Amino acid sequence: GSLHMIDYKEIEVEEVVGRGAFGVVCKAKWRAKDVAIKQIESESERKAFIVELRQLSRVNHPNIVKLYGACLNPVCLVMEYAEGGSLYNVLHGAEPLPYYTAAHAMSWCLQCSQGVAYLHSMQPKALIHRDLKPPNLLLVAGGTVLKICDFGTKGSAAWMAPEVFEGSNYSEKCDVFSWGIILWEVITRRKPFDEIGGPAFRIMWAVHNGTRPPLIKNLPKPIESLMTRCWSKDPSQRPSMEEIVKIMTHLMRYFPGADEPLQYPCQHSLPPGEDGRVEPYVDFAEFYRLWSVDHG
Numbered sequence: 001g002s003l004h005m006i007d008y009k010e011i012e013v014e015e016v017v018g019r020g021a022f023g024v025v026c027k028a029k030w031r032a033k034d035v036a037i038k039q040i041e042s043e044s045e046r047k048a049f050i051v052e053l054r055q056l057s058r059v060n061h062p063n064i065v066k067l068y069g070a071c072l073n074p075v076c077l078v079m080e081y082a083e084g085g086s087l088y089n090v091l092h093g094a095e096p097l098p099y100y101t102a103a104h105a106m107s108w109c110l111q112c113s114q115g116v117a118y119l120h121s122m123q124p125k126a127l128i129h130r131d132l133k134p135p136n137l138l139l140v141a142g143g144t145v146l147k148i149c150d151f152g153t154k155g156s157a158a159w160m161a162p163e164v165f166e167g168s169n170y171s172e173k174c175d176v177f178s179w180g181i182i183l184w185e186v187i188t189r190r191k192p193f194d195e196i197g198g199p200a201f202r203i204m205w206a207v208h209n210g211t212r213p214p215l216i217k218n219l220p221k222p223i224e225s226l227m228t229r230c231w232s233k234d235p236s237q238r239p240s241m242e243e244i245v246k247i248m249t250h251l252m253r254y255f256p257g258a259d260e261p262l263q264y265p266c267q268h269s270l271p272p273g274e275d276g277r278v279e280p281y282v283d284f285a286e287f288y289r290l291w292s293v294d295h296g
């Protein structure tokens with residue numbers, strides 16, 4: 001593809017607002033627009049930043065961060081300012097948190113799978129994200145549109161597929177695992193493996209021994225079936241991202257209201273405990289009602 005060259009002097013750097021696998025992301029201004037820039041911290045991570053630039057120049061999809069351009073001296077990527085911040089911050093951040101619906105949960109997950117499916121279909125060689133997690137999922141358009149960033153490629157163990165820890169030959173299917181865990185997280189509004197805690201190796205041992213997030217009380221069987229297939233030990237038993245897109249696209253018939261912006265506050269006491277099954281944050285009553293009308 002191609003990249004728009006940008007003069008660094010034309011960029012005005014405001015406060016630092018995030019930190020990826022490498023570099024540091026900041027809020028900024030450029031040419032009568034709000035923008036997010038991503039500068040290098042050191043010369044050691046220059047080669048990583050160039051490969052990211054070469055990949056981002058090729059990608060073009062509604063659910064991947066728009067890259068306006070780049071600077072070469074100093075090295076930095078100029079991106080769209082995601083108004084809504086990260087998904088992580090919307091789910092778990094500082095109060096007041098926003099109210100969201102099952103429809104938002106499923107729409108977010110559909111949009112993520114749409115973006116990952118585009119990367120997995122890239123020719124000649126597929127782009128694997130390798131680090132899919134809510135801190136890398138940004139929200140725009142009042143919290144209704146989701147976008148993937150920091151792709152290609154620590155603190156990620158909770159979303160990372162077992163075969164990746166093991167140093168084993170891995171594939172596209174590592175992102176399907178991550179997506180599975182993200183679906184649980186948006187439905188429950190819970191940090192996965194928060195109760196295990198400790199350092200990263202403790203979650204890695206857990207997940208390697210078969211541990212997965214608890215099942216969700218009253219979760220529709222079609223959604224429970226997709227979720228649990230996504231986090232199989234064997235990556236060949238997980239569905240492709242193309243299959244996830246189709247299934248999730250079809251399910252959205254029963255989840256209307258995904259285009260409503262997040263505007264209501266939420267007072268939070270998500271009921272912990274009850275070992276084994278957990279309660280969802282979102283409500284499925286409307287799902288079951290609409291399903292029944294179509295089926296019986």
Ligand SMILES: Nc1ncc(-c2cnn([C@H]3CC[C@H](O)CC3)c2)c2c(Cl)c(-c3cccc4nnsc34)oc12
Nearest residue numbers: 017018019020025036079080081082085086149150
């Ligand atoms: N393009 C982007 N636009 C906006 C943000 C971002 C996150 N929080 N916030 C603000 C939003 C307003 C709130 O009052 C205070 C937090 C903006 C962010 C953030 Cl954070 C990242 C980010 C995080 C991790 C890795 C990575 N790679 N490329 S961009 C990126 O990109 C952003």
